[PDB]
Design an enzyme around this catalytic site. Structure first.
Site, PDB file in Angstrom:
ATOM      1  N   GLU A  40       2.719   8.610  -4.787  1.00  0.00           N
ATOM      2  CA  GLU A  40       3.941   8.270  -4.070  1.00  0.00           C
ATOM      3  C   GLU A  40       4.710   7.158  -4.778  1.00  0.00           C
ATOM      4  OE1 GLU A  40       2.915   8.047   0.304  1.00  0.00           O
ATOM      5  OE2 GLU A  40       0.884   7.788  -0.484  1.00  0.00           O
ATOM      6  N   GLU A  79       0.864  -1.168   0.000  1.00  0.00           N
ATOM      7  CA  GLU A  79       0.000   0.000   0.000  1.00  0.00           C
ATOM      8  C   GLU A  79       0.905   1.224   0.000  1.00  0.00           C
ATOM      9  OE1 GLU A  79      -0.616   2.390   2.686  1.00  0.00           O
ATOM     10  OE2 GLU A  79      -1.814   3.548   1.264  1.00  0.00           O
TER      11      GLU A  79
HETATM   12  N1  SAH Z   1      10.193   2.454  -1.495  1.00  0.00           N
HETATM   13  C1  SAH Z   1       9.619   2.440  -0.198  1.00  0.00           C
HETATM   14  N2  SAH Z   1      10.289   1.452   0.447  1.00  0.00           N
HETATM   15  C2  SAH Z   1       9.986   1.156   1.752  1.00  0.00           C
HETATM   16  N3  SAH Z   1       9.011   1.856   2.399  1.00  0.00           N
HETATM   17  C3  SAH Z   1       8.328   2.855   1.752  1.00  0.00           C
HETATM   18  C4  SAH Z   1       8.630   3.149   0.456  1.00  0.00           C
HETATM   19  N4  SAH Z   1       7.814   4.168   0.058  1.00  0.00           N
HETATM   20  C5  SAH Z   1       7.013   4.500   1.110  1.00  0.00           C
HETATM   21  N5  SAH Z   1       7.331   3.695   2.156  1.00  0.00           N
HETATM   22  C6  SAH Z   1       6.757   3.667   3.449  1.00  0.00           C
HETATM   23  O1  SAH Z   1       5.348   2.918   3.359  1.00  0.00           O
HETATM   24  C7  SAH Z   1       4.498   3.517   4.174  1.00  0.00           C
HETATM   25  C8  SAH Z   1       3.244   3.960   3.383  1.00  0.00           C
HETATM   26  S1  SAH Z   1       1.775   3.623   4.399  1.00  0.00           S
HETATM   27  C9  SAH Z   1       2.110   2.179   5.435  1.00  0.00           C
HETATM   28  C10 SAH Z   1       1.313   0.946   4.899  1.00  0.00           C
HETATM   29  C11 SAH Z   1       1.255  -0.108   6.012  1.00  0.00           C
HETATM   30  N6  SAH Z   1       1.683  -1.349   5.521  1.00  0.00           N
HETATM   31  C12 SAH Z   1      -0.157  -0.229   6.529  1.00  0.00           C
HETATM   32  O2  SAH Z   1      -1.038  -0.625   5.780  1.00  0.00           O
HETATM   33  O3  SAH Z   1      -0.423   0.068   7.697  1.00  0.00           O
HETATM   34  C13 SAH Z   1       5.214   4.725   4.728  1.00  0.00           C
HETATM   35  O4  SAH Z   1       5.520   4.515   6.006  1.00  0.00           O
HETATM   36  C14 SAH Z   1       6.514   4.860   3.894  1.00  0.00           C
HETATM   37  O5  SAH Z   1       7.619   5.324   4.774  1.00  0.00           O
END
Ligand code: SAH
Ligand code: SAH
EC number: 2.1.1.-
Lengths: 347, 343
Positions: free
Chosen positions: A146, A137
């Site tokens: 993003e 997500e």
């Molecule tokens: N390339 C990337 N690699 C690792 N983490 C990432 C990323 N891009 C965004 N994120 C992280 O993913 C998160 C997006 S939201 C978190 C989703 C979580 N799995 C849930 O459903 O509760 C953010 O914390 C961000 O820091």
């Protein structure tokens, strides 16, 4: 004692009291959780979406890989369904720990592991084997807002195996021209009695994509009219598509169902895996209040041409209207310009 | 092409109109984010028009702090003031005001100075003004130091007979229960999965603008658990920020029993019979006001445990709160006093 440079207290006047649980905690982590994560976790329908799709792909022999673990809720779901191993990647340091703590607080400290890195630097060495399932997500108010497609594509090329199921499967970004007087009163001025103010219109932002929530608006609360069928800006198959499958410039020929003033282009999106759907469309988020607060919808004010002052886009039912959609290089930003009859290279 | 040009922060492929290309980004952001909404807040405009026409003679010299677009100065001029000097700190906004003034042929009635009121000296004015005009209120009334800026001008430039507009300001607070806000600001878990550790990070200190949650209080359902708490009132013609005690305490009797999820912050400005209210009960039809100001919110933690404790009200009982102001009285905080606090 010691205080981290990014400690919460540092942001706060000496006269104002701060609970010990917050004082030395990093500002960004606090800001991250309070601004996004709380709202994400109360999106039951979102959580229910990922639980159901995982439910039909998790065997005790299923190796799972999640991009962007954050709190680790999705990774917990994978393990909860009895997965063989779960490796969750998270870019920021403090979110990484918070995931692990949630993982110890629950059963799964043996099952789920959280790596501090970006998925970009994730190598085959860091995994037990190629995963059976890839979890993600990383959608914003704009689907690729993003860079969800880019992060999966990189991982898809390097770490996944043929039989790997990618969750979620499909994604579609939609656009709709809308009339909305309430929005118009926030973004336009003609004058106040004798006083002419129409010069203020010189500065109206017709270019920027704007998130409804950031400027205090919820489209479900506001009355507006859709002046046309949805416009499929693009579809994406996360297990085959690239970001160049989305042409950097596209043209859409829109038929007006209803006459009215297209104050703005309204942007929503739907994510599909089999029979299960994730919708950003305000019609589907009427009762999903947390979703409107986490993702909501995006807007862009429309200008008909390139006059000294903005020209209103007026739709006449049955008559046809032509739009040039320009993406940025990373396909993260876009724009809808009405074709004239020379900003656009429409033909 | 200025370094702050609007195009320079936009992808090369996206089309930008000529009216926007070389325009400073900050100007565009300001006008689009706030000014448009201000100008459509017709109750606000009508407020100042009615207070002005009560004091504007063809013998009245008017000084406005914070012209911005300069609409209020156009009002003072329209009401036939002999001279109007509007001071504006933003260089680009100052020119925008001037243009609006030419478009209404009041080029010689209203003069716009590019400076901060702190630098405004008697030299810059024809005469000590008869009327002082200000709109420097934030979502928090003193959030933009409206009191301090007036005090400086009041100490240096005004004359005894100078009528200050507006006269009175009152910062209110109400403890509220709001299930919608609670779902955005808290998490217990998801089925068997326990996520209560997430609660360790719940922001209980920060004052957050309701619209930054994405919320308009008029659309969301909530209950007020007590009568309004008058945090402080200010007389802009005599009060100083020192008149506001750095720390105040409040006997708050619960009208109703419920969960004080948060302290709601609104305010009211008074001049004679006229009222400018931020209370969501008055902004039900004033959609532009809720967008330019809206209300403020602070989440309430009952004590100092490792986890947030809900402040729960029982109807008829008393709840003492300590209110701490920052030095410039721009920021404040409401903390429940237990049977961190000095009580
Ligand atoms: N390339 C990337 N690699 C690792 N983490 C990432 C990323 N891009 C965004 N994120 C992280 O993913 C998160 C997006 S939201 C978190 C989703 C979580 N799995 C849930 O459903 O509760 C953010 O914390 C961000 O820091
Ligand atoms: N001490 C100060 N001195 C001069 N201008 C100030 C100021 N504090 C804030 N401002 C400016 O005043 C404006 C606040 S809003 C403008 C309100 C204006 N009366 C209108 O209705 O159009 C901003 O442009 C701000 O830069």
């Amino acid at each position: 004692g010691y205080r981290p440079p990014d400690a919460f207290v540092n942001r706060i006047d000496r006269n104002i009291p701060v609970p010990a649980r917050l004082r030395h905690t990093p500002v960004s982590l606090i800001e991250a959780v309070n601004d996004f994560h709380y709202a994400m976790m109360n999106d039951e329908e979102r959580n229910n979406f990922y639980y159901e799709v995982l439910k039909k792909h998790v065997t005790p022999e299923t190796g799972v890989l999640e991009i962007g673990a954050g709190s680790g809720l999705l990774s917990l779901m994978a393990a909860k369904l009895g997965a063989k191993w779960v490796v969750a990647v998270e870019g920021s340091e403090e979110l990484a720990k918070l995931a692990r703590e949630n993982i110890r607080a629950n059963n799964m400290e043996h099952q789920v592991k959280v790596l501090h890195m970006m998925s970009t630097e994730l190598k085959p060495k860091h995994l037990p084997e190629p995963p059976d399932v890839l979890l993600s997500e990383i959608f914003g108010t704009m689907m690729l807002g993003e860079s969800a497609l880019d992060y999966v594509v990189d991982v898809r090329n390097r770490l996944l195996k043929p039989t790997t199921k990618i969750i979620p499967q499909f994604g579609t970004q939609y656009a709709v021209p809308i009339e909305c007087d309430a929005l118009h009163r926030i973004s336009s001025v003609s004058g106040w009695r004798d006083l002419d103010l129409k010069h203020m219109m010189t500065l109206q932002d017709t270019v920027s994509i704007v998130f409804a929530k950031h400027y205090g608006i919820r489209m479900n609360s506001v009355n507006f009219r859709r002046l046309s069928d949805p416009i499929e800006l693009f579809r994406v198959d996360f297990s085959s598509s690239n970001r160049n499958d989305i042409s950097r410039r596209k043209h859409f020929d829109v038929v007006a169902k209803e006459s009215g003033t297209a104050h703005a282009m309204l942007f929503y999106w739907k994510v599909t895996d089999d029979e299960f759907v994730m919708s950003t469309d305000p019609e589907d988020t009427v009762n999903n209040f947390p979703r409107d607060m986490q993702w909501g919808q995006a807007l862009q004010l429309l200008d008909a041409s390139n006059g000294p002052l903005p020209t209103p886009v007026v739709f006449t039912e049955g008559k046809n209207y032509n739009f040039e959609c320009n993406f940025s290089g990373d396909r993260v930003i876009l724009h809808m310009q009405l074709c004239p009859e020379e900003m656009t290279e429409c033909e």
